[model samples]
Target: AAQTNAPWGLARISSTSPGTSTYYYDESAGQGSCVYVIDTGIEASHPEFEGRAQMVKTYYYSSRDGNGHGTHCAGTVGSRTYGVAKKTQLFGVKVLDDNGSGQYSTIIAGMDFVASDKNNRNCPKGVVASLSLGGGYSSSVNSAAARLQSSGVMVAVAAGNNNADARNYSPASEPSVCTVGASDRYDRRSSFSNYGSVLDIFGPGTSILSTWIGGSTRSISGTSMATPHVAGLAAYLMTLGKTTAASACRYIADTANKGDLSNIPFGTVNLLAYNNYQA
Candidate 1:
């Protein structure tokens, strides 16, 4: 069936209201796309992955996910149960340590690896980098993200949880990448989500439940949780012929559900991310 009982975030994108639990989507949704989750790491053994999620690269100590953050983000991106793009392949590019801390150098190295993989045909046709972590403005990190995008990979970064101007952040401030903010089930901007013109769109982040370590699940909130939704959407769009990063970015913003979210800061795009699914 093209319709399935889904999570609130999934259902919200396919509808204008909060009623019904079914998320209507295309049968071919993100079938050929690949999402590279640049974060802690992923538990490829997790059932949500269905063998599609793997640790392809790591700049950290180990490929195994000692932290649950990366697994949660990966689940939101393409897990069979909690994903935005249920059928897309997932690759875990670990840059952060088990403590969920990493240097900008490691972050840049991870991005570089993804760029090389996309360029060398190691990844599939549609490639997207899901960055669910961020910090203060760093020219080096921003430049690496730009280079990753230019290498034919769509980059989706978190606007951050600082509740300040997104322009004060690194990749989020970078004009070349798609920066995402957080929204609640009530169609409201999350208080902790960063704002300003740098944000490309908003996605459900509050109380979001997704896969965690050891085959479990957890509920969490952050722009970190919101970004993968956009990343997954970009991968879905790629499967639908929005192959290029620029095209996918434009189409995502162009087709988003507009003016629905409340408490949007001045200069922030009032667009909410959507999967382009019709009922």
Candidate 2:
């Protein structure tokens, strides 16, 4: 197992790079920014995350942490101690209960909350919603995603961890969402990450080391872990005035290291390349 400082280990290699470290120093700490995480509730008392997370609102469709999936996912995205966007406010929406699953209606309701006009007023004007959950591709889901996109809200979703084609997944398969696949430490696709022509971009998601409930640390591998990296990057880009979803996407994609597409699924996610362009 690869050891990393990031609880999710999502960026083990990149985080250690001298250039990436310098980039982190150059970029702002993302203070006063906000992002909605439609996953499990975040652990509010972690020391590393102390005073860093603000739960704008929480809807508990399920009673408790079922499989710790949401918790892990939350830590990966906004856990101050372990997340890429440590200073960003996180709104927890618990559509999936402790069982690691939820009904489509429940998930959609969660989406509605984030997309709702009432919710948007209290949140940052250009808030980004990061989702690690999805269902099979459906026209209705695609429509919902399109609606969200049109509203100037950016949606980032996992491209699924099926280790197969990505066309089978929802929201991720939706053209409007920023669908992300998983890449390894070497900037190669994680064996488990689903891939296809529809993938918008890729990010680090293998052997992710992230905070778990009960103050434990563990490694998880999935596209779920990959999505937040892009979400954080999106927020960072937005801070740099890459406000529109398309511009942010282009900033990330066009700047990404477009190298060796033969071995990697979507080629490398040129983090350094994008960072340079933004600088």
Candidate 3:
């Protein structure tokens, strides 16, 4: 659980590169897998995401995309053709409005919707849940996440971008969920990534390029961007049959490259090595 620098070295990858694939390769060959992005709604018609997003449901928890955080975060995870998992199905839940704020109860309600529809047969058999926001941690949150895990759902959450000593809020702090911390391209923790023993893994988050509303694109920073890196990795791992959140976490930890922990506060997180680690 020691804090370390960002390990994936993803900042060097250009979003416009014709051959550049962020986080991991699309080796799944467009496998029929689905992932749910529970955040602010996405730009459903953006060219980068056109024909890629399937609207399972859209709950207007917040007003609009005034801050554009949700749309940016959504692009990082599963933008129609620009994200790490371009082919993965995305379920958008607008728990926060354009102001970039919402109640914990609204977030929980979104999770409830996912848990209920997970086995509907109308949806994919297995689902990987992506959350790009976090706040205060709680035991109740942990319990709720555990229920999702018990039900065969893989939950990926942000460790918070507050740069605090511990993770923030419900699912991210939950043991059953995979808590992702932010790191720069050099395998160093982002200056703003929250660190602690509860953190399960690290991913690229510094100055990420993703889709935005109104056919625009931009670069943003936060563990929010980093969370989707793991979500995409989880989908790739699932293609190899590592479906459980715990199993995916283990694969990442065991495969990550060791680094210089001396200069890094807490310690070094092995991210680049993990990204390059082969099964």
Candidate 4:
């Protein structure tokens, strides 16, 4: 699908002057919609999230951002200011530990946790899942994500930060999931972001500023930072009733432009996230 680059540019807005940019696409708190962060966990009481996160499952620790990575990603996915869907609620689906390491099966377990909706007691509806951790390729992880997606969940995954072909990594190589890479407002790739035909899109990931643990904020990067950009967009698309979660991510490439793909490896895709446009 052909798209325009203007909306991708709007992505760099920090919600102060152009908070209206996202409001143009999604209104309200993304009621009935949710994004599940499949990472360490989230700081539920952070000012950006303010107790809106529900810890649905975990693999290593309790439902809190003890390592801080999860909170930052959650902020990117749905913080009131930094998120694509500020009003949307968050769900913590922890798989990695404070050291940011975990088994691939841990990912599958978290996937199943959400796929079954924890025995129908928490967020039984369809959700968009955000994953920012990757060590090596794992087919089971993709299979797990596909299962949840088949049940109406939207999963956006990271394209590893090893500066290698994402096709070699687990969720990145998982074609069924929304595979994301990182690019900055300068149209330059981050020093550590991986790329290839396996990647579907790019977002602001260099020194990204977002919510942190202990009710603070931090700046970080990686394809990890980039994944939530698409995740947020996906959840927001669901909130707008634009289409089914299955088809919601399709609009992204269909609506974005190719200006940012020139320097990217396998620079053949113009699937950057674009939610704004001009007359």
Candidate 5:
């Protein structure tokens, strides 16, 4: 984070209360930072964001969050009361449709735009790209995440809901992006969460409550829900300093709380967000 100067303190996300979270991240409180959500379109007029949200890029997905998935991800990442980075500018880059599906090429194309966004130079110190959706693996998207990672832009991805292996996924399998897994308030992994060495950390994903389309709120589960929490944390770290993929992941791993997660397959005392340290 180069110039974070938001006008707030450690934000209280009512939606994540004693249930999903207990962490507080307000370094400059994402004042001049930005977070890009590459998922279904966003309802820019949502009351939670007032008018700070915008659709930076659009593809096959409808202009609005027809499926409300993108708005959910956006809210969890940077909404005023529901997000982690309260004041960070939220940009909706629609890559998926109402069915929560999209082409790998479109995702890669969206990554390219996020990597080279014109406003990264002066608008905000850190520009993070959050991808809470992905299916199969794609070398193209992997390459794109790598390119952006090399350029000081951080990319966070979901480990997937397959309950299989994350190594077979796209951004999760991509070494350059931060791959996230799902857990509950009790620090238990979700039954559908993918595992393996590909996963970097875990976050509250089971029945997560956040802002939705039409000025609404909903609780959903999946690695998709787990991904944005890590993404928002990455954006929060940006205000502290710039980091490469390895460095960013390393810092989170080093700083995250080390708790019992033995039940998590392939998980060894790994890091978990909202470690009860910052708040």
Candidate 6:
């Protein structure tokens, strides 16, 4: 299907401004990149994936996604129907459980697997990871996430939904991660989205529609739903030879639409993620 028929978030990112709802992206945007969804897990049977999504790691549970969160995020990242980068390879790294919650150790373990895989694959294209979860600051988790990036996987994390300073969050506050905040269709910051200089970019998050666990779809809101849009953009850049996570993140921000969003809290950068599409 043409990206012109994609979801509003996908359309918004591809456009330089709000109001239009038709997405435009390059045909080869994600042709050579792989994206890892680090959350509950993914339902590989979903038709939106078109056999591109797989569950490669699970932390003490089944590989299938019992919760819909991970599948939703994965769809936004690379599903053929509602994705930002439709051609990127999709892999699920299950760190959270069916309840959409998990321990720090489990999350770290999943991070380790992606880092190892990056070293093992040594692919020319980029390896990207999207994490849509967050909690209180944990130095250990922050360090683990940094190590994951050092291993060549570009990591994108949610900037928290607490409406507080993002610096208080773990992976989001970590300098090595590309922290993302949430924005609405009108380019207003979502009231629940945390803000601060820690945020690398913002993505459409309110009422985002994407694939679900039962071969269906859902529309949900959170910084969790927003992070993958940037992750997909990172993967798109990786396919273009921006293999390093930091470089991809820098490119994402450098290419973003500036000063268009409203209600952005003080300290938060006014940059919105874009896919380098001009239509």
lDDT value for model 6? 0.87
| TM-score list, all predictions | 0.96, 0.82, 0.82, 0.87, 0.86, 0.96
Window of ten residues with lowest summed lDDT in model 6: 117-126
After TM-score superposition, the amount by which residue 90's alpha carbon in candidate 3 deviates from its true location, in angstroms, is: 1.0
Q: In candidate 5, which residue pairs clash?
A: 1-238, 1-239, 1-241, 6-31
TM-score of 1: 0.96
The residue-level lDDT of candidate 4 at 163 comes to 82
Tens-digit lDDT string for candidate 2 (50-120): 65544444445433444556666666665655566556666666766655676777677777777774255
Quote the positional error of residue 262 for candidate 3 in Å: 8.2
In candidate 4, what residue range of length 10 has the lowest lDDT sum?
1-10
Query: How well is each residue in 77-182 modelled by candidate 5, as lDDT tens digits?
Result: 8776667766777888888978878888888888888878735444456677789988788777788878766766667889999988888888888876788888
Q: Candidate 4, after superposition: displacement of residue 117 in Å?
A: 1.3
Return the top candidate by lDDT: 6
Candidate 1 Cα misplacement greater than 4 A, ranges: 1-3, 120-124
TM-score of 2: 0.82
76-142: candidate 3 lDDT, tens digit per residue: 6666434655566666667666667667777777777777776763334357778887768766666
Alpha-carbon deviation at 103 in model 4, angstroms: 0.8
* Model 1 clashing residue pairs (backbone): none
Error of 1 at 120 (Å): 4.5
Candidate 4 vs 6: which has more lDDT: 6
In order of listing, the candidates' clash counts read 0, 9, 19, 3, 4, 0
Error of 5 at 44 (Å): 1.6
The Cα error of candidate 3 at residue 80, in Å, is 5.2
Candidate 3 Cα deviation (angstroms), residue 15: 16
What lDDT score goes with residue 196 in model 2? 81
- lDDT, each prediction: 0.87, 0.62, 0.62, 0.72, 0.71, 0.87
